[PDB]
Amino acid sequence: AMIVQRVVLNSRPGKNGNPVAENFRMEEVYLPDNINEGQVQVRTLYLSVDPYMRCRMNEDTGTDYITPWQLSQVVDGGGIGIIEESKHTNLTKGDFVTSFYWPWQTKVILDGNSLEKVDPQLVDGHLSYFLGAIGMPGLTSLIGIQEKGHITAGSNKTMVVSGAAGACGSVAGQIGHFLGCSRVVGICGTHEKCILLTSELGFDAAINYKKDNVAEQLRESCPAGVDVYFDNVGGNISDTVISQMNENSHIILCGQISQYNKDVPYPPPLSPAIEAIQKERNITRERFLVLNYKDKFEPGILQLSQWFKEGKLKIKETVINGLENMGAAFQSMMTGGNIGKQIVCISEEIS
Numbered sequence: 001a002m003i004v005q006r007v008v009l010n011s012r013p014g015k016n017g018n019p020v021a022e023n024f025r026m027e028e029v030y031l032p033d034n035i036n037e038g039q040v041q042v043r044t045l046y047l048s049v050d051p052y053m054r055c056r057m058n059e060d061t062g063t064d065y066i067t068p069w070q071l072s073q074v075v076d077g078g079g080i081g082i083i084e085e086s087k088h089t090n091l092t093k094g095d096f097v098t099s100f101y102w103p104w105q106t107k108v109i110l111d112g113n114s115l116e117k118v119d120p121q122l123v124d125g126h127l128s129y130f131l132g133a134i135g136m137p138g139l140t141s142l143i144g145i146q147e148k149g150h151i152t153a154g155s156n157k158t159m160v161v162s163g164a165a166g167a168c169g170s171v172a173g174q175i176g177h178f179l180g181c182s183r184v185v186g187i188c189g190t191h192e193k194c195i196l197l198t199s200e201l202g203f204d205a206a207i208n209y210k211k212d213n214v215a216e217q218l219r220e221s222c223p224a225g226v227d228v229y230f231d232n233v234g235g236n237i238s239d240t241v242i243s244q245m246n247e248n249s250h251i252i253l254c255g256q257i258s259q260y261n262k263d264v265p266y267p268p269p270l271s272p273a274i275e276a277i278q279k280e281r282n283i284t285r286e287r288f289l290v291l292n293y294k295d296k297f298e299p300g301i302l303q304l305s306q307w308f309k310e311g312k313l314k315i316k317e318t319v320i321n322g323l324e325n326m327g328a329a330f331q332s333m334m335t336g337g338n339i340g341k342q343i344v345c346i347s348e349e350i351s
């Protein structure tokens with residue numbers, strides 16, 4: 001019985017509370033010496049932390065698509081690992097695999113049918129990109145823009161992206177330029193993030209919402225108004241952006257992270273004054289859930305991989321090390337510690 005470390009949900013912060021590292025706890029358990037037919041033993045390499053996990057910390061998540069985590073039970077989420085032993089007829093030792101339901105544990109015995117084999121060449125060997133820009137967040141940005149943005153090459157539209165220096169946002173602003181937007185302006189929470197948006201990611205301008213007059217900066221950077229708003233944050237920032245959105249414009253409602261530590265149903269309605277603007281200007285604001293478009297996942301991943309391999313898509317991530325830091329990593333991402341996709345490195349043992 002090998003000793004492995006795992007992370008379990010130690011306490012719930014409450015639907016109206018703030019998540020902290022201590023809501024999680026790391027403990028040791030013994031691993032089976034026993035691998036059954038159809039099972040594989042995997043060594044975890046990278047785990048993801050993501051904003052949607054904030055609702056899994058609640059007793060009731062709010063929807064049918066995601067189940068709540070249970071107290072004292074191992075937590076799970078997107079992960080990537082290497083097969084160390086296989087008794088599954090279609091997986092081999094050394095294969096790299098992923099699952100959206102990877103337990104937060106150093107080594108695990110899993111049913112082979114619950115795993116997907118990945119192709120390292122799609123990410124030039126950066127397996128953690130499968131949890132990000134060449135994964136669910138990048139797919140969310142691409143499909144969201146393609147389905148809800150209404151952008152065409154040649155229309156010279158202006159796109160504003162909130163949460164611009166995060167996983168979805170950093171990819172969304174780039175895709176905005178790839179697909180036809182002439183101006184892409186990002187709103188984020190730090191000066192350093194602002195610098196990266198314009199120096200490395202091709203944004204035309206960057207606004208720090210903690211230090212800048214957002215409305216004033218939107219008037220300067222979006223001189224022709226806002227035609228597409230890729231929204232990751234909601235709250236006051238979105239109210240400000242919507243106030244400068246043009247006739248027949250579109251809000252790609254990706255997420256509303258500024259509201260995730262509150263019991264308001266998702267997506268939160270707009271205040272009467274802001275909703276009045278939306279109605280008067282015919283601004284579209286529809287829900288967008290990436291799981292409603294799984295038939296576009298394969299072509300999407302290939303397109304994201306191709307843009308990366310062509311040297312056009314810049315992939316940003318922030319890494320924290322060690323399973324003992326999962327809770328800290330989730331708390332850090334929720335409060336802005338990350339540039340690009342937040343990842344936790346569990347191990348680099350691949351040989």
Ligand SMILES: NC(=O)c1ccc[n+]([C@@H]2O[C@H](COP(=O)([O-])OP(=O)(O)OC[C@H]3O[C@@H](n4cnc5c(N)ncnc54)[C@H](OP(=O)(O)O)[C@@H]3O)[C@@H](O)[C@H]2O)c1
Nearest residue numbers: 051140166167168188189232254255256257258289290336
């Ligand atoms: N629709 C879907 O299918 C789908 C799929 C995946 C993700 N999403 C959504 O997309 C958003 C981005 O997800 P992601 O994974 O890319 O995470 P992310 O942007 O990498 O990380 C979350 C970022 O949110 C910002 N933030 C946190 N609290 C905030 C607040 N009160 N106000 C303004 N900004 C705040 C922080 O950056 P700053 O320093 O800039 O504050 C932080 O780094 C989330 O709303 C998520 O729920 C939707």
